Amino acid sequence: SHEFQLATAETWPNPWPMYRALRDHDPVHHVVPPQRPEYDYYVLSRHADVWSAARDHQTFSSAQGLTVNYGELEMIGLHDTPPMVMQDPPVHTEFRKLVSRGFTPRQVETVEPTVRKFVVERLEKLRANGGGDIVTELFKPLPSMVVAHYLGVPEEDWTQFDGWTQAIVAANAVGALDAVGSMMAYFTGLIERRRTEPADDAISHLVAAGVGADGDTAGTLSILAFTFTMVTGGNDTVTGMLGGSMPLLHRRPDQRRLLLDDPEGIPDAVEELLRLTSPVQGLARTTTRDVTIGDTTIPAGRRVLLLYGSANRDERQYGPDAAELDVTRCPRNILTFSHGAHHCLGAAAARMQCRVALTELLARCPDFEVAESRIVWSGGSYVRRPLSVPFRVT
Amino acid sequence: SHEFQLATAETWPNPWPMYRALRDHDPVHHVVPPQRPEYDYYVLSRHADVWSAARDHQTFSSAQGLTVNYGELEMIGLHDTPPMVMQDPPVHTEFRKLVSRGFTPRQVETVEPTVRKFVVERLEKLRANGGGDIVTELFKPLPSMVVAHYLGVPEEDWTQFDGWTQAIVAANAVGALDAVGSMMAYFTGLIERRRTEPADDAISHLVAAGVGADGDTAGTLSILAFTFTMVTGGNDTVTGMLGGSMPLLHRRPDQRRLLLDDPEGIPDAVEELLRLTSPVQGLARTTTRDVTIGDTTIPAGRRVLLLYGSANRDERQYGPDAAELDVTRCPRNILTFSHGAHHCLGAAAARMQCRVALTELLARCPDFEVAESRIVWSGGSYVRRPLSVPFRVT
Numbered sequence: 018s019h020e021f022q023l024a025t026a027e028t029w030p031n032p033w034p035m036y037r038a039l040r041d042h043d044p045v046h047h048v049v050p051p052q053r054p055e056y057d058y059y060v061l062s063r064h065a066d067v068w069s070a071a072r073d074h075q076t077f078s079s080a081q082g083l084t085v086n087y088g089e090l091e092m093i094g095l096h097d098t099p100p101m102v103m104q105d106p107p108v109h110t111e112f113r114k115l116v117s118r119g120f121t122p123r124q125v126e127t128v129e130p131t132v133r134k135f136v137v138e139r140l141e142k143l144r145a146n147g148g149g150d151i152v153t154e155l156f157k158p159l160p161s162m163v164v165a166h167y168l169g170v171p172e173e174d175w176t177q178f179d180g181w182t183q184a185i186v187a188a189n190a191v192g193a194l195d196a197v198g199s200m201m202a203y204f205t206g207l208i209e210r211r212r213t214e215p216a217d218d219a220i221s222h223l224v225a226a227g228v229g230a231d232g233d234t235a236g237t238l239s240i241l242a243f244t245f246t247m248v249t250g251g252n253d254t255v256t257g258m259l260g261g262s263m264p265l266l267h268r269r270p271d272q273r274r275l276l277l278d279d280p281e282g283i284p285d286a287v288e289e290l291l292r293l294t295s296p297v298q299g300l301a302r303t304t305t306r307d308v309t310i311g312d313t314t315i316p317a318g319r320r321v322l323l324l325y326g327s328a329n330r331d332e333r334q335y336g337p338d339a340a341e342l343d344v345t346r347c348p349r350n351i352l353t354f355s356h357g358a359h360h361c362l363g364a365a366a367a368r369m370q371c372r373v374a375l376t377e378l379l380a381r382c383p384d385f386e387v388a389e390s391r392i393v394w395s396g397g398s399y400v401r402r403p404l405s406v407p408f409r410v411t
Numbered sequence: 412s413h414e415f416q417l418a419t420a421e422t423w424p425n426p427w428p429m430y431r432a433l434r435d436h437d438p439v440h441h442v443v444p445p446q447r448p449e450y451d452y453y454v455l456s457r458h459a460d461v462w463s464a465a466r467d468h469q470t471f472s473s474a475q476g477l478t479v480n481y482g483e484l485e486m487i488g489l490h491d492t493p494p495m496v497m498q499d500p501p502v503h504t505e506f507r508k509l510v511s512r513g514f515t516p517r518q519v520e521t522v523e524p525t526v527r528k529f530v531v532e533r534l535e536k537l538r539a540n541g542g543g544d545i546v547t548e549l550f551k552p553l554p555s556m557v558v559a560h561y562l563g564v565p566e567e568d569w570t571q572f573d574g575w576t577q578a579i580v581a582a583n584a585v586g587a588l589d590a591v592g593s594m595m596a597y598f599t600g601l602i603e604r605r606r607t608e609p610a611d612d613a614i615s616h617l618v619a620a621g622v623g624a625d626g627d628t629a630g631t632l633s634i635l636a637f638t639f640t641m642v643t644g645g646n647d648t649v650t651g652m653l654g655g656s657m658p659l660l661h662r663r664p665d666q667r668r669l670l671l672d673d674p675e676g677i678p679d680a681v682e683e684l685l686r687l688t689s690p691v692q693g694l695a696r697t698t699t700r701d702v703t704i705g706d707t708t709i710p711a712g713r714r715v716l717l718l719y720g721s722a723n724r725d726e727r728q729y730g731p732d733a734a735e736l737d738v739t740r741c742p743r744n745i746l747t748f749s750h751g752a753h754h755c756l757g758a759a760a761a762r763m764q765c766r767v768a769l770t771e772l773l774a775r776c777p778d779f780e781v782a783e784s785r786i787v788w789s790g791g792s793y794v795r796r797p798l799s800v801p802f803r804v805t
């Protein structure tokens with residue numbers, strides 16, 4: 018189909034033709050669901066429009082939620098302590114300033130050796146076995162460890178924390194009461210501990226800055242909400258980047274050759290893989306005013322889907338070859354991590370995971386096979402990530 | 412309709428004819444959903460069968476959930492720390508023994524004066540106004556205060572705790588992430604405090620008995636799960652009892668007269684109101700073996716709905732007048748609180764709330780009007796409770 022529809026597990030394999038039809042024939046596309054026309058919304062598919070809209074938080078607000086479902090906030094129960102990703106400036110600004118103290122080059126650097134050691138252990142296990150499911154074995158557990166690091170979870174607690182993570186990621190994707198309860202409970206204790214034993218992580222930084230101090234329960238709640246944002250934001254996305262890169266690399270031995278011969282080209286290659294996988298394929302905003310983009314006026318009060326995945330594939334920005342892998346492309350202004358106020362805090366951490374995984378795949382498992390038709394994609398309309406990528410090595 | 416269907420807001424007004432058709436023509440009724448026949452289940456509608464099945468936890472297990480939906484436990488996320496209501500003996504037995512220490516006559520007696528003071532304040536406010544919505548004003552907030560008492564929540568925290576309660580009750584009925592997180596967070600702190608400042612409540616008793624002691628995180632989790640059981644079990648049910656009693660009393664001035672002339676008959680009247688309102692109208696079990704009841708064999712591995720609401724209206728147990736209010740009936744072996752291992756821990760607390768509310772309604776607002784067709788019932792197929800009961804007083 019070339020007709021717009023929110024993605025499902027069955028339609029994630031190849032949304033690209035549908036994106037191209039939108040970019041070419043209806044860049045400001047009005048969706049009116051036949052069964053509930055009251056839930057109409059708009060879709061932005063071009064790079065220029067998505068880039069500008071992401072930046073313009075004034076006009077395009079995050080404060081009513083990030084899906085095209087108008088009942089979202091009440092449906093999930095996120096009105097009273099909205100996560101930072103559903104806050105507009107100025108509310109968003111102070112908390113983002115404080116938490117950013119846990120997202121410096123230091124925090125990416127300190128976990129890199131742990132990432133590499135884990136990637137190596139799992140890839141060697143897969144190699145010895147002639148392959149296996151690289152998602153369950155590596156691409157799923159890896160990002161959970163990195164989120165744990167950023168939350169200052171002691172290494173000894175990583176296995177327990179991963180249990181909760183996986184339940185929440187599954188429930189969030191498209192149902193995790195024990196996990197959401199156990200986690201919010203665990204973090205209550207960790208926050209308390211960080212009052213007297215602060216480290217360099219984001220939770221320690223929030224506590225040290227006085228968030229939740231002197232009976233400010235709302236502050237403590239904001240820290241807890243941040244842990245949920247981290248778990249829901251830093252896991253399935255990374256798995257989508259890592260798993261989604263596999264067929265792209267497999268089908269382009271010329272591109273693998275470039276990186277085998279020049280491993281120093283791997284950071285640039287990571288940008289290209291991020292552009293093409295765009296794990297967050299789209300997120301919504303709500304218009305605060307009527308806004309005209311080209312020949313269409315979007316009314317105030319409607320949801321607008323920013324199709325990062327299409328923006329990243331826009332021939333107007335990247336050329337007629339936008340749909341193809343070119344590891345030397347050095348794409349700029351990618352929308353994989355959005356743009357503006359909410360630009361992904363974990364961008365450096367995601368880039369580091371991609372770099373280490375790609376480096377070790379080429380070094381340890383260079384003769385590998387992926388069957389694209391055997392990939393199983395997760396349900397859910399916003400994030401594109403595989404549940405399984407069968408993987409064979411010789 | 413007289414054809415079996417799970418109840419909705421629209422069908423809660425009058426399920427009784429449908430129950431009677433089941434009792435008379437298909438007491439062991441096989442439901443095969445046309446759209447998903449793989450989700451077939453059975454319904455028990457007679458008192459004798461429901462009484463025996465509730466008692467026989469061996470044959471009729473709670474461990475797979477309490478609804479007729481086979482995916483229930485994973486859908487809600489309650490596998491890893493199953494609540495006590497979804498535990499079978501022997502697992503269920505120790506925890507129930509420990510927590511029962513917080514459900515003695517002492518705990519009902521200590522909160523009664525607070526209940527009465529609140530009922531009085533709200534009824535006087537309604538009287539002064541010539542009526543209003545007795546659900547929002549009284550029948551909703553009251554049971555939340557009583558659950559707070561049983562959880563050892565300090566009175567100063569009751570307003571905050573009610574906020575979370577209402578979100579969870581709405582989400583549980585048929586979506587409360589901030590509430591479920593804030594509550595599980597709050598209780599983590601309260602449990603910690605009870606380690607050194609124990610009171611006579613159920614949480615204090617669990618902590619004093621060593622549940623969660625010495626790094627036993629699973630124990631602490633069980634206490635947290637119990638708070639959720641309490642919030643989901645002790646609120647909408649009581650509101651259903653109180654609100655559901657209103658039309659029954661209104662339409663029977665002879666029955667009100669009996670209690671105006673003999674207020675000492677009110678405890679017995681409460682049993683009759685519990686029988687007719689049966690707020691938990693049904694809950695499911697799973698068969699562990701093939702079981703024959705009359706001419707029908709229920710296979711092992713299927714859900715069986717125990718229709719407490721029909722059992723309570725069974726002419727075979729209560730007589731041809733089973734459908735009618737008789738405050739002097741003194742019904743015995745009611746199934747309002749089930750029967751056997753899981754018999755409602757809050758039965759005494761529910762009975763006390765009914766008694767106080769009924770006593771004060773007759774004393775303060777005896778000339779009152781309820782329009783049954785104006786009552787709005789909550790969605791959800793298991794608990795029958797109004798969201799609104801318009802109420803007028805002269």
Ligand code: HEM
Pocket residue numbers: 079083101102103113163164167246247250251252254255258295296297300353354355358359360361362363364366367
């Ligand atoms: C390839 C992997 C990732 C992708 C594609 C991705 C994508 C995004 C996007 C698109 C946003 C902005 C959302 C919007 O437009 O409304 C965002 C925000 C965010 N991301 Fe990521 N993310 C990734 C990995 C991570 C990781 C690993 C972490 C944590 C270590 C993380 C933490 C966050 C946080 C905390 C925000 C909220 C920032 C704010 O609202 O100010 N992300 N991410």
Ligand code: HEM
Pocket residue numbers: 473477495496497507557558561640641644645646648649652689690691694747748749752753754755756757758760761
């Ligand atoms: C009219 C009001 C109430 C009704 C109709 C009701 C009904 C029930 C029923 C039918 C069960 C057994 C569930 C099953 O068959 O699987 C139960 C269990 C339970 N109820 Fe209630 N309940 C009411 C009020 C309360 C209150 C006020 C509290 C707390 C103060 C409470 C706490 C509990 C608990 C903790 C259990 C679990 C017992 C166990 O599984 O061992 N209930 N209730």
